[PDB]
Amino acid sequence: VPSQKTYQGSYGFRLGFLHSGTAKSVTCTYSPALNKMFCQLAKTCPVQLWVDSTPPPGTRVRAMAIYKQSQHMTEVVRRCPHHERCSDSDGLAPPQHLIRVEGNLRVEYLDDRNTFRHSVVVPYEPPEVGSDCTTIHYNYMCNSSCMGGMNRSPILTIITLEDSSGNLLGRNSFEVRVCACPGRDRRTEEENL
């Protein structure tokens, strides 16, 4: 099971999010209280990368999903039988992968040869001039448990910064729920606090 320990490392790596609120028209919203993102299926999901020093060119950023619940944590997170079979290919992402990146032609997808786990990687790019952070647009393509089934575990996204040789530079994470009405579900989960 991949590590989920937060690790800022030598470049001072951490994540930032937009403050989008919970209006009905919102397609993507982050709960600071829950450290949890609520997303419509396949909609743009901005995640910000913040560093204290700029990692070198060739640095890469990987996203991997795991199941939070102990009884399901060794299971590979992948799309349910419905979403796997959807004609929603962008010609890059394998159809089983839950997490995609949009708007990046250098995106790379991995089926791990040893663990079988899926991940998606892009090149780390520094903030543009006069910007304080780098944004990656994720798309989540399934909530895993869309059709039911034993596994109702929350899903955690782990974001790792790695160098061009695969050395871990930094790590962070957030929970994610893909749903039709993200604003409503955020409000409801926060009420349960």
Residue set of the binding site for Zn(2+): 80, 83, 142, 146
Interface with Zn ion by CB under 5 A: which range of 27-35, 50-58, 83-91, 122-130? 83-91
Listed residue (66, 41, 55) closest to 151, CA to CA = 66
Q: Tell me which of 15, 26, 37, 169 binds ligand [As], using CB under 6 A.
A: 37
The end-to-end CA distance of the chain, in Å, is 28
Question: Rounded to whole angstroms, how far apart are CA atoms 102 and 105?
Answer: 8
Is 63 among the residues that bind ligand [As] (CB under 6 A)? no
Which CB, 83 or 97, lies closer to Zn ion? 83
Q: Tell me which of 63, 65, 80, 120 binds Zn ion, using CB under 5 A.
A: 80
159 binds, among Zn ion, ligand [As], none (CB under 5 to 8 A by kind): none
Element (H, E) at 84: helix 81-84
Which CB, 104 or 151, lies closer to Zn ion? 151
Is 98 among the residues that bind Zn ion (CB under 5 A)? no
Question: Rounded to whole angstroms, how far apart are CA atoms 118 and 126?
Answer: 25
Residues 125-184, interacting with Zn ion (CB under 5 A): 142, 146
Q: Tell me which of 15, 39, 121, 136 binds ligand [As], using CB under 6 A.
A: 39
Residues 6+ apart with CB under 8 A from 181: 24
Question: Rounded to whole angstroms, how far apart are CA atoms 171 and 66?
Answer: 14
Under a CB-based contact definition with an 8 Å cutoff, are residues 36 and 193 in contact? no
Q: Which residues bind Zn ion (CB under 5 A)?
A: 80, 83, 142, 146
Q: Which residues bind ligand [As] (CB under 6 A)?
A: 28, 37, 39, 45
